[PDB]
Amino acid sequence: VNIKQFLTYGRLQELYCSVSEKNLLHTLLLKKNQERQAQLKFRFTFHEVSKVLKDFLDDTCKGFYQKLNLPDMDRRCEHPWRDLFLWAILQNRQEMANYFWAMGPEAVAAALVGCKIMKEMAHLATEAESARSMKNAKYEQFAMDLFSECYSNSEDRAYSLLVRKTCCWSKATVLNIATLAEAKCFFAHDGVQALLTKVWWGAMRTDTSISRLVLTFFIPPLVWTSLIKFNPESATFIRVVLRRWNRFWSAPVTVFMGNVIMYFAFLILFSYVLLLDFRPPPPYGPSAAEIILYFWVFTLVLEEIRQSFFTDEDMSILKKMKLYVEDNWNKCDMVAISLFVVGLSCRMAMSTYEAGRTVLALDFMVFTLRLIHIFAIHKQLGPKIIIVERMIKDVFFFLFFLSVWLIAYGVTTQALLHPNDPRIDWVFRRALYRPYLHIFGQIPLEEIDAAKMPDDNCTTDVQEIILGTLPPCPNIYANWLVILLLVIYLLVTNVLLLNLLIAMFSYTFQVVQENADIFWKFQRYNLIVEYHSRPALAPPFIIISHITQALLSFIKDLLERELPSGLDQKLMTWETVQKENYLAKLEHEHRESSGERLRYTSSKVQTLLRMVGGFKDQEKRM
Amino acid sequence: DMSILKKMKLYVEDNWNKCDMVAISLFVVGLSCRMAMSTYEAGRTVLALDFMVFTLRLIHIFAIHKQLGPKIIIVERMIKDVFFFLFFLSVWLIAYGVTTQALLHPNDPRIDWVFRRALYRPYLHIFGQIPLEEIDAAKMPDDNCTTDVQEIILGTLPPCPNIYANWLVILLLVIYLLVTNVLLLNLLIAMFSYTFQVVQENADIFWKFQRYNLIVEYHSRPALAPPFIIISHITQALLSFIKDLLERELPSGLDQKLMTWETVQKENYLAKLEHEHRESSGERLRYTSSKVQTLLRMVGGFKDQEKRM
Numbered sequence: 001v002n003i004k005q006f007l008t009y010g011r012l013q014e015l016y017c018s019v020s021e022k023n024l025l026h027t028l029l030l031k032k033n034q035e036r037q038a039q040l041k042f043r044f045t046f047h048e049v050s051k052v053l054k055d056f057l058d059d060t061c062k063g064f065y066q067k068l069n070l071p072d073m074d075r076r077c078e079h080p081w082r083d084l085f086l087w088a089i090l091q092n093r094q095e096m097a098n099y100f101w102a103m104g105p106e107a108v109a110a111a112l113v114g115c116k117i118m119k120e121m122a123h124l125a126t127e128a129e130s131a132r133s134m135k136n137a138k139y140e141q142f143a144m145d146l147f148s149e150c151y152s153n154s155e156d157r158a159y160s161l162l163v164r165k166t167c168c169w170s171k172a173t174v175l176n177i178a179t180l181a182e183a184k185c186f187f188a189h190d191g192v193q194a195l196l197t198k199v200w201w202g203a204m205r206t207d208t209s210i211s212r213l214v215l216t217f218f219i220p221p222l223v224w225t226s227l228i229k230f231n232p233e234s235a236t237f238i239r240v241v242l243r244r245w246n247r248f249w250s251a252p253v254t255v256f257m258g259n260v261i262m263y264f265a266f267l268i269l270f271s272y273v274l275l276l277d278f279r280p281p282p283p284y285g286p287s288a289a290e291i292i293l294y295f296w297v298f299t300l301v302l303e304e305i306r307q308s309f310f311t312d313e314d315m316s317i318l319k320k321m322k323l324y325v326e327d328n329w330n331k332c333d334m335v336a337i338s339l340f341v342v343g344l345s346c347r348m349a350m351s352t353y354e355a356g357r358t359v360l361a362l363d364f365m366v367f368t369l370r371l372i373h374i375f376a377i378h379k380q381l382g383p384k385i386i387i388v389e390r391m392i393k394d395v396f397f398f399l400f401f402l403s404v405w406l407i408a409y410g411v412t413t414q415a416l417l418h419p420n421d422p423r424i425d426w427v428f429r430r431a432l433y434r435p436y437l438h439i440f441g442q443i444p445l446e447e448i449d450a451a452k453m454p455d456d457n458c459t460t461d462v463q464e465i466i467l468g469t470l471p472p473c474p475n476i477y478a479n480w481l482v483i484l485l486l487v488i489y490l491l492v493t494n495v496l497l498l499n500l501l502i503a504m505f506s507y508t509f510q511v512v513q514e515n516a517d518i519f520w521k522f523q524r525y526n527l528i529v530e531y532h533s534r535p536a537l538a539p540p541f542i543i544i545s546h547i548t549q550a551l552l553s554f555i556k557d558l559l560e561r562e563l564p565s566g567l568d569q570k571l572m573t574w575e576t577v578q579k580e581n582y583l584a585k586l587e588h589e590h591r592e593s594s595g596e597r598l599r600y601t602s603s604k605v606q607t608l609l610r611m612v613g614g615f616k617d618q619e620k621r622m
Numbered sequence: 623d624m625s626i627l628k629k630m631k632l633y634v635e636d637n638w639n640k641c642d643m644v645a646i647s648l649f650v651v652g653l654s655c656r657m658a659m660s661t662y663e664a665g666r667t668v669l670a671l672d673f674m675v676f677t678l679r680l681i682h683i684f685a686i687h688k689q690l691g692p693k694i695i696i697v698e699r700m701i702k703d704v705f706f707f708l709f710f711l712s713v714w715l716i717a718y719g720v721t722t723q724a725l726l727h728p729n730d731p732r733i734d735w736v737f738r739r740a741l742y743r744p745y746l747h748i749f750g751q752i753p754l755e756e757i758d759a760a761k762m763p764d765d766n767c768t769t770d771v772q773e774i775i776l777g778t779l780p781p782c783p784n785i786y787a788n789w790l791v792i793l794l795l796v797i798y799l800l801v802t803n804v805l806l807l808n809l810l811i812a813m814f815s816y817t818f819q820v821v822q823e824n825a826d827i828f829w830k831f832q833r834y835n836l837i838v839e840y841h842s843r844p845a846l847a848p849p850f851i852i853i854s855h856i857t858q859a860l861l862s863f864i865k866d867l868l869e870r871e872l873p874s875g876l877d878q879k880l881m882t883w884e885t886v887q888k889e890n891y892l893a894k895l896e897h898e899h900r901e902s903s904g905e906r907l908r909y910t911s912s913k914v915q916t917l918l919r920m921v922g923g924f925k926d927q928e929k930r931m
């Protein structure tokens with residue numbers, strides 16, 4: 001059977017029509033067909049499967065069958081193995097999907113597509129067994145192992161494979177398909193991380209020392225010295241020096257260093273303005289440093305807006321805003337800009353001047369917190385941030401138990417100790433603020449224990465208590481109960497709950513570290529990709545880059561590259577050969593496994609015993 | 623036979639040697655300053671720091687102990703978790719301290735007190751030092767204090783802490799205490815636990831390697847401790863000017879006997895390896911499968927002959 005000649009578009013349509021009506025694909029096609037019929041031979045046509053693929057693969061499958069609107073039923077499928085793989089994946093037929101993947105031209109991208117579709121269908125599966133099978137699809141493992149073979153073979157053709165635009169998946173890069181598939185473990189592979197490191201260091205050698213890089217950054221003339229080694233590949237001299245300067249100063253690592261230094265400068269300036277150079281309203285006027293700070297924040301907002309909305313040519317504005325608000329650090333950034341605007345507005349007025357100062361102090365807090373996210377690309381700091389995010393839940397469990405016990409103890413002690421105090425603020429003080437401070441070793445026995453209570457003259461009159469002329473007299477009717485309750489509450493909270501929280505953090509760290517590291521590698525991919533369109537000038541100098549780009553656009557990458565036809569064919573042939581080697585090695589290591597040897601020995605011993613018994617019968621006859 | 627520059631590089635490659643150089647530099651500077659009236663107090667200060675450094679060297683003196691050395695290596699390995707905790711704590715501490723300084727003393731111009739209230743107090747919050755008497759208005763003592771900038775600078779009266787929005791100050795203190803004293807501290811405890819469990823063995827191997835060098839160092843070390851070691855130094859210098867258990871050269875016969883014994887032991891080792899490989903389960907299965915296949919083919923030939931006969 002010749003699948004290229006066997007599989008036409010008609011047979012593919014017939015295969016899509018002959019769904020067993022008991023799995024997910026039939027229900028999805030039913031919904032799509034009902035929608036198509038309402039909006040108005042074969043039970044389903046290629047438009048329904050195109051819509052299903054769109055739901056799973058937003059634009060990876062664009063033009064697979066819409067382009068010709070359905071194609072000719074009599075024509076051979078251009079990518080028959082791709083179509084069969086998609087058809088088998090869409091209905092959880094993993095054995096045929098494995099076969100069609102092993103028989104396909106572009107297997108890493110196909111495996112990533114299968115991973116994406118399987119994890120998309122795992123949410124839609126009604127039965128638990130099918131959902132479990134989809135959740136154990138192990139197609140990302142196939143992609144990882146095939147790329148391991150490819151990276152071991154060449155390690156240079158592997159990067160080209162990672163960055164080349166695939167023919168069978170609508171010019172989608174393998175890294176693009178991995179990002180869409182959200183393949184954490186594929187991005188954690190050593191080859192992908194090495195390519196990311198090569199991109200990160202730019203034109204410089206990846207073994208460049210950090211100290212020499214910092215010394216070259218602080219002292220620009222050292223760029224032209226041989227202190228920093230670079231990766232190979234009057235007017236001539238000017239061109240050479242300009243090329244060296246632009247090669248050093250446009251690498252992602254130097255851009256990151258400049259951004260970090262300028263953010264430290266921004267925090268220093270913000271704190272100087274807030275603490276030492278904050279002036280009365282415009283009647284007297286904001287200081288010059290405050291105006292520079294306003295301009296600085298304006299440049300920061302421009303960089304954020306550009307990076308978030310002015311980087312993708314084809315992408316929905318509403319979808320871009322949803323992507324922006326989906327990130328919690330972006331929520332922090334919006335909180336920071338809102339606080340800055342509100343504080344500036346209030347500061348411009350005399351009646352709201354102090355409120356403006358307060359809001360600007362909160363804004364400094366928020367920006368200094370953003371400083372944590374700035375260092376998310378560090379090799380050792382990012383996974384720790386992810387680990388903290390994972391331990392927030394143990395923090396919340398401790399907080400639930402502590403809150404219950406704290407409310408009980410605080411309200412009971414308030415009732416037992418100051419029954420006659422009507423002030424709501426002091427009720428809440430003694431009921432929540434004091435027991436909370438008991439956790440941090442702040443135990444003020446001077447107002448809990450009668451023997452320790454100072455004998456300053458104090459009133460029992462309600463009006464005098466409300467007016468604040470004298471403190472209220474703490475009731476000491478049954479103080480043994482107050483002391484006993486304090487003892488029990490201290491025991492519970494400061495021993496059991498605190499050390500239980502310590503134990504929970506220990507266990508969570510030990511069980512989370514590895515997944516946190518894989519997540520960090522996936523996040524590091526996106527962080528490094530963000531520097532491709534990021535200008536080399538840090539704020540506030542980034543205004544120059546913004547103006548230059550805007551003017552160039554109005555007047556007039558290492559990743560995701562398109563190769564010539566010959567090289568692209570050579571690379572796909574090399575990928576197929578590597579896949580054949582991988583499959584042969586798998587079948588070999590299976591064939592000389594202990595279990596297969598035992599099976600072979602048992603079967604052959606049984607057959608040999610039967611044949612020798614026949615021979616013995618013949619000998620007895622003879 | 624060893625290069626002077628290479629010897630100096632080897633010396634400065636050791637961090638304990640860096641500590642020793644710091645100690646001797648501090649001693650010399652302190653003595654020099656102490657010899658002068660105008661620098662006497664500075665000399666006393668530097669000599670106190672020098673005592674600190676020497677007492678720290680006392681840790682390295684006990685590096686050859688069976689149980690103490692690996693613990694020193696383990697501490698060296700946990701310094702990195704200390705640094706992670708310090709990064710997170712530094713970020714949160716700077717944020718909280720500067721925000722509280724802005725909210726609470728907006729009119730204080732003294733740089734030293736700005737840095738005090740911005741870093742020294744939040745840092746002490748980690749060790750249970752929470753002075754609510756200057757953070758909470760209801761607890762602030764009513765000693766008479768000035769709002770005049772000149773009087774604040776002169777130090778005649780303490781500045782008046784602003785209590786405009788004190789609920790925010792208390793809430794920020796609550797949140798900062800929660801974060802730093804619970805999450806960061808217990809996370810650091812968890813990180814030390816994991817690091818200890820995953821480091822102890824390699825730390826012990828490193829200690830054994832270091833113990834080799836420490837024991838070798840005693841071959842040329844004189845038996846007299848300081849200050850009596852001056853006698854040994856003078857004696858050796860005079861003997862050199864006027865005129866080991868390890869690394870020994872053997873006679874030819876014994877050396878040949880030892881190399882022959884080594885070769886015989888290596889042959890025994892290789893034979894035992896090949897033997898324990900030959901009677902392994904996998905090799906037995908491979909042998910059985912191959913011989914069963916060959917036997918089946920031969921018995922099939924015999925059965926064909928019997929059918930013919």
Ligand SMILES: C[C@@H]1CC[C@@]2(OC1)O[C@H]1C[C@H]3[C@@H]4CC=C5C[C@@H](OCC[C@H](CO)CO[C@@H]6O[C@H](CO)[C@@H](O[C@H]7O[C@H](CO)[C@@H](O)[C@H](O)[C@H]7O)[C@H](O)[C@H]6O)CC[C@]5(C)[C@H]4CC[C@]3(C)[C@H]1[C@@H]2C
Nearest residue numbers: 449450451452453454455476479480481483484485487488
């Ligand atoms: C192993 C485990 C550890 C935990 C625990 O279980 C075991 O320990 C138990 C020990 C127990 C405690 C043992 C003992 C007591 C004492 C008892 O008093 C009863 C009241 C007595 C008897 O009528 C009278 O009171 C008087 O009040 C007056 C104030 O009104 C004071 O006047 C003051 O006036 C002014 C105040 O400024 C100043 O001039 C002076 O300061 C002073 O002149 C008197 O001086 C004082 O005499 C109350 C209970 C208490 C604290 C126990 C509580 C529970 C424990 C901690 C157990 C744990 C589970």
Ligand SMILES: C[C@@H]1CC[C@@]2(OC1)O[C@H]1C[C@H]3[C@@H]4CC=C5C[C@@H](OCC[C@H](CO)CO[C@@H]6O[C@H](CO)[C@@H](O[C@H]7O[C@H](CO)[C@@H](O)[C@H](O)[C@H]7O)[C@H](O)[C@H]6O)CC[C@]5(C)[C@H]4CC[C@]3(C)[C@H]1[C@@H]2C
Nearest residue numbers: 403425428429432433436468759760761762763789792793
């Ligand atoms: C389970 C979890 C634990 C943590 C937490 O969440 C829950 O608990 C919450 C509880 C909450 C707190 C609840 C209540 C409050 C009170 C509130 O007051 C608002 C201001 C009021 C109302 O206009 C007025 O103030 C007045 O100021 C004056 C000073 O200017 C004082 O005069 C003093 O003058 C002199 C000072 O030396 C001396 O003569 C005396 O000392 C005294 O005469 C008055 O006495 C006092 O009345 C501020 C906020 C605070 C502290 C909450 C903070 C947040 C919590 C801890 C929550 C946690 C997240």
Ligand SMILES: C[C@@H]1CC[C@@]2(OC1)O[C@H]1C[C@H]3[C@@H]4CC=C5C[C@@H](O)CC[C@]5(C)[C@H]4CC[C@]3(C)[C@H]1[C@@H]2C
Nearest residue numbers: 403422423424425426427428429432433789793796
């Ligand atoms: C963690 C929660 C947050 C929400 C809350 O409980 C803890 O906070 C508490 C702080 C309380 C304030 C504290 C001080 C005053 C001043 C007083 O003159 C009038 C009452 C009022 C406004 C109180 C109203 C009730 C409030 C919001 C409580 C509220 C349930």
Ligand SMILES: C[C@@H]1CC[C@@]2(OC1)O[C@H]1C[C@H]3[C@@H]4CC=C5C[C@@H](O)CC[C@]5(C)[C@H]4CC[C@]3(C)[C@H]1[C@@H]2C
Nearest residue numbers: 268712716731732733734735736737738740741742
């Ligand atoms: C851990 C870092 C070390 C470096 C540093 O920040 C923490 O130390 C801080 C101590 C500060 C000192 C403290 C006291 C005074 C006295 C005052 O009359 C003039 C200003 C001056 C010298 C301050 C200048 C800025 C200094 C060095 C800060 C500096 C960023």
Ligand SMILES: COc1ccc(/C=N/NC(=O)Cc2cccc3ccccc23)cc1OC
Nearest residue numbers: 327328329332369370372385386388389710
């Ligand atoms: C020890 O401090 C931290 C450790 C880890 C994170 C992770 N943020 N992970 C995020 O997604 C952002 C975020 C999350 C939650 C609360 C935040 C508050 C302020 C600022 C950012 C927040 C943040 C931390 O401080 C702010």
Ligand SMILES: COc1ccc(/C=N/NC(=O)Cc2cccc3ccccc23)cc1OC
Nearest residue numbers: 636637638641678679681693694695697698
């Ligand atoms: C609990 O204290 C210690 C535990 C382990 C070491 C290891 N030093 N390991 C070294 O290589 C020397 C060194 C290293 C780093 C800082 C030092 C400061 C003072 C003195 C020596 C330093 C040191 C300690 O105190 C000084």
Ligand SMILES: *[C@@H]1O[C@H](CO)[C@@H](O)[C@H](O)[C@H]1NC(C)=O
Nearest residue numbers: 454455456457458459469470
């Ligand atoms: C005790 O009460 C008197 C009023 O009679 C008052 O003058 C004094 O301030 C109170 N307490 C003290 C000793 O300060």
Ligand SMILES: *[C@@H]1O[C@H](CO)[C@@H](O)[C@H](O)[C@H]1NC(C)=O
Nearest residue numbers: 763764765766767768778779
């Ligand atoms: C209160 O101010 C006065 C000046 O009028 C001063 O004498 C006194 O020392 C200040 N505080 C107190 C009560 O010590």
Ligand SMILES: [Ca+2]
Nearest residue numbers: 304329330333
């Ligand atoms: Ca952002």
Ligand SMILES: [Ca+2]
Nearest residue numbers: 636638639642
């Ligand atoms: Ca030494």
